[PDB]
Structures are given as C-alpha cells and as structure tokens.
C-alpha cells in the first residue's frame, strides 16, 4: 500500500485512523542492555507496553507511531510481539538518535553511507525482518547542531527524497534546534510538510512555534504529561491558543510516553515530581476534554489526530 | 585460582606465560550492530579471530588480554567460541569505553551504580555467564577528561579496591589524558602498579612516558602496527630507548589489533596507508627481533611479556 506496519500488511494513509504520532513501546541504551542484561526485565517491559497500548485502543487509538531508533533501543521483534498481543497498527521508523557524536562505526563514513542504512530499513526491512521503516527519526538537543548531528540530518534528507517517507525530529524547544533542523532539511530539498519538528510543546513561546509551522512543517505538541519540561495546563493553554489562531493544520499531539525507559531520570521515585499523570492516554483524560470545553469542535480534533497524520504519511 | 579465563578454570597469575596484554578479538558499536546487523558477518569475524589467535599461539603466546568492553562490542559468548577453537588463555574485562558522554541510561545515576556494574561482571559473571572479568577498562581521548569520563574513572577505582583486579586504560598520548587517569585513580587509593596507562607508544615523547612510569604505573607501548598513530620504526626506537634507560619493568607491549573492527577508518583501502603490517603477530616478525639485535637479552623480553603481566594481575 503506502505505509508499512510492524507485523502487518502495509496500509494506505487513508486507513491510518486516530493516531498517536509519538509514543515509545520501550526505550533503552543498546550498549548498556547488551553488556548488563541483568538490569532489564523483558517480561515486565512487555506487560507494560501491552497494557498501555490496550488502554490507548480502548479510547479509539488505531495507529501508534513509535520513533524508537538507533540510540533508543529499537527492537522490531519486541514491537512485533506487542502488535501480536494487541492488534494495534504500529509504524516503526529508522534513523539515528544522538545529541553530540555518532558511534565510532561512522568515523570516516560519508553522509551517503548513513542514508544507505535508513534506505535499507525503508526498502528491505528492519533488523533482518521484512518489517519496514515508515519514517526517519533524527535528533538535536542542548548541544545544538553539531557536525555529526548535521550529518544525520542530511542523511535523513537523502532518505526522504529517495523513498518519500516523512521525517520526525527530536528537538530542544529552547535553543532553536527545531528551526535549524527544518532549515537544513528544506534546503536539502525536503518538502516542509514531510517534517514533524518535535517537542515544541515544551515551550509556551508561541511566536517560535508559529514560525516553524508557518515555514510548512508539523509542530510536535508531543510531550503531554512531562511536567518537568512544561506542565499540562500550560501545554493546554498553548495548544488552545494555536488552535484559536488557526494552526490546527499543523498541530500534532502526543505524549512521548515510554511504557518502559531505563534512564536514571525516569525511575518511580521521581515520577510524582516530574510527570505524575504521564501516560499514553492523558490527552483523552485531560487535554481533549479541555479543548472541547473551550469551544474546540470534533472537526478540529479529527484534523489533529486523523488528517494531519494522514497528510504526513501520504 | 587467581586470574579468570574465558571458558577455562582460573589460573594462578604466575602461570600466565607469554602474554599479549591488549588485543581485540572483535570490536563493534553495540548500537550499530543491533540496528543494522546486515553490516556484519559473524563467520568472517570468527574465522579471522581464530586464525589470528592460533598464529599468535604458534609464536608461543599463551595468554591474550582483551579489553573489549561496553562501547567496543564485548561479547563473552563469541569469546568462548574462539577459546574453544584455539585453546588460548583469554582474559575478558569489564568497564566502559567512552570519549565524551555516557549512554542515556546513566543520566542521574551515581558513580557507585556504575561501579556496581563492574563488580557484577567481576564477581558474578559477564552477560549472564559464569565467565568473570579479570580487569577494568576505561578510556579518554581527544575530548579530554569530561565529567562522564571522570565518573567512569572513579567507578573503576571503586571496582579495583573492592575486587583487586587491575585497570587497563585507553588514552590519547598527546593531550595528557593518561597522566590524568593515573592521577585520579591513585588519588582514589588505587595502587599505581595495578594500572596500565595505554597508547603511550603513540608518541615519541619519552619524557611524558617516563613521568607516568615513574609515578608507578605500567606504560602501554601497545599499538604496534598502527602507523597512523606512530610508525613501527619510531615505536621501536622509543621502546628500545625506554629499555635502555631501565624502564623494562614498567613496559608492556601489544598491537591493540582488532581481528575485526567495524569503523570506517579501518577497512581494506586505508590499511596499506594507515597500518600495512598491523596484525596480532607483528612484534614477533619485527619488534622483538629488532630489540634482540640491539642488546636486549632474553631476560628483558621475558620481563616485558611474562613478569610484567604477572605482576599486573597479582
Ligand atoms: Co524526543
Ligand atoms: Co584503546
Ligand atoms: Fe520520543
Ligand atoms: Fe584497544
């Protein structure tokens, strides 16, 4: 068809339905898990992922896009297990998630070689399977657009131009990285509308957010529940304001929820302080009803959660 | 019952025999291999490692110490297959190899949590097996002693003090990282004689090398064949000079040869320029004959390749 799914036949973008554009079934550091497997519990990770996905589906979520890629512990077989246990439509991606430097493997390797990896996942399959990547994921954060970060961005541009899969980004809302990602990508020939600039919901600086959307890309209001970056109420007020200003055409909403994540920052003790209501269904419980009670009609909701993901992937 | 061996009963340090203190059966980026297995060929890797190890054994090598750890693709089960096929004494280690930052797992984790990983590997076993780590490996390079690099150094100190295993380091011979490693370690109570400061052979700066050796630590003239760092002839001249000045009892010699390595810098085309004679037996073809033809008697050879590793591991 058009959009590849984990453990399923590919579907036309018109079949994507209600979508969570940015959620993680499981995140871990590849090298740590490989070296110290005693730190991880696959049974628990699987239960958590399945339980979260099931609840998401009980609210009418049809499709989840999971931008777990190199550096976040992408595991296609785990994803496949989750799909088999839930029946969710799952879009897996390819890409590289780094903030500073690429792994030593890439020393003296070209941007083209990097893009070749993305294209391989897109055209042939991920990690030895026939499950194909439906988008490319790239990142930048506090360190900004380092040289390796830039190489990855340009490789993503090459992959998009070859295969037409969209590009999802991770960015830091406070240091211009999102705008810079969009700039490099569009200069490399990437259609602005094939890019989702991520984590813009971490700021209430609406002029910045509008600037990215106005240049043609989707804007990721995609960390609902992560109060340590920005509280739910402030995200809500920002979201509502953008909608009132007519930006529904570019808005994408999600939680960036990790059903399991191995970082020290996570960990139960900090959750009450850092992300008390963080989960894969918070927007159904809080955000969406908030918007409706403030005059946002169902047609806008559908644009955000059905139409935008549809355009993104077509 | 003193030095743990992969796939073998432990041996008394005095039985270690002729030792290559720093060689790699295989090196790769964990994240890259997990994400793009199509880039690797385990058959080739296995055959290369076996062929190299048994040629080293024909030259009388009894023990190989392999400091492949997290970040370099440590794989205890691959190491076991190689031991089974060769009968070599192989010492595996634990540790973390980074130049800048730790994997995201370590965000908000203490130096003690890191040290616990090392101790686990030393006391319990590596990657779910009963093969135990016989030393700790740490690293620093161009970027210098970063905050995360220093945490790993301090974690290694804790591991050594708890378990008594020695510490092998990776350094950049031109920026003082080696001296710093020694400083921090010793300041944390590590016996300087339980430290090997690596890659000092990369420079002909005899004074720097001597200062480290004078402070009580072993010095790694350990990249023989890697011309891109320093040609064989200049290495030999430094080595001979050092021995001439009475540093035999601090010198350790190796190739840091990677029977297979995935980095772009490696790779066929660049070999004839970067490392034409690089292999696990270059010192038997070149270095050792050069030393012996220049006044180095068999006692000094035995000291570097048998006594020093013995002391290091006891
Ligand atoms: Co992100
Ligand atoms: Co090294
Ligand atoms: Fe994410
Ligand atoms: Fe090495």
Author numbering:
A (entry chain A), B (entry chain C): 1 to 314
Describing publication, verbatim:
PLLs are natural lactonases endowed with promiscuous phosphotriesterase activity. The catalytic center contained two metal cations coordinated by four histidines, an aspartic acid and a carboxylated lysine residue. A structural analysis of SsoPox, a hyperthermostable counterpart of the PLL family from Sulfolobus solfataricus, has revealed that loop 7 is shorter in SsoPox than in PTEs; linking the active site to the loop 8, which forms a hydrophobic channel that accommodates AHLs aliphatic chain. Indeed, W263 is located at the start of loop 8, involved in the dimer interface of the enzyme and positions the lactone cycle of the substrate onto the bi-metallic catalytic center.
A single mutation of W263 can significantly increase the paraoxonase activity of the enzyme (by 23-fold with the W263F substitution), the oxo-lactonase activity (by 148-fold with the W263T substitution) and the activity toward the poor AHL substrate (3-oxo-C12 AHL; by 55-fold (W263V)). However, whereas detergent-induced flexibility has no effect on the lactonase activity, we isolated variants of W263 that exhibit increased lactonase activities (W263T/V/I). These variants exhibit dramatic improvement of their oxo-lactonase catalytic efficiencies (148-fold for variant W263T), while the activity for the best AHL substrate is compromised (3-oxo-C10 AHL; for the wild-type enzyme). Conversely, the LacSV group dramatically increases oxo-lactonase activity and 3-oxo-C12 AHLase activities, while the phosphotriesterase activity is mildly modulated and 3-oxo-C10 AHLase is decreased. The residues selected in the LacSV group (T, V, I) are overall smaller than those selected in the PteSV group (F, L, M) with the exception of isoleucine (I). Mutations W263V-T therefore yield enlarged active site cavities for the lactone variants. On the contrary, the paraoxonase activity of LacSV variants exhibit a behavior that is similar to that of the wild-type enzyme, i.e., the activity keeps increasing with temperature (or remains higher than ambient temperature activity for W236T around its Tm). The analysis of the normalized B-factors of the variants clearly reveal that the substitution W263 is destabilizing (as confirmed by the Tm of the variants), but also that the active site loops of PteSV are significantly more disordered than those of LacSV. PteSV lose their activity before the loss of the global structure (Tm), whereas LacSV do not, and exhibit a similar thermophilicity profile to that of the wild-type enzyme.
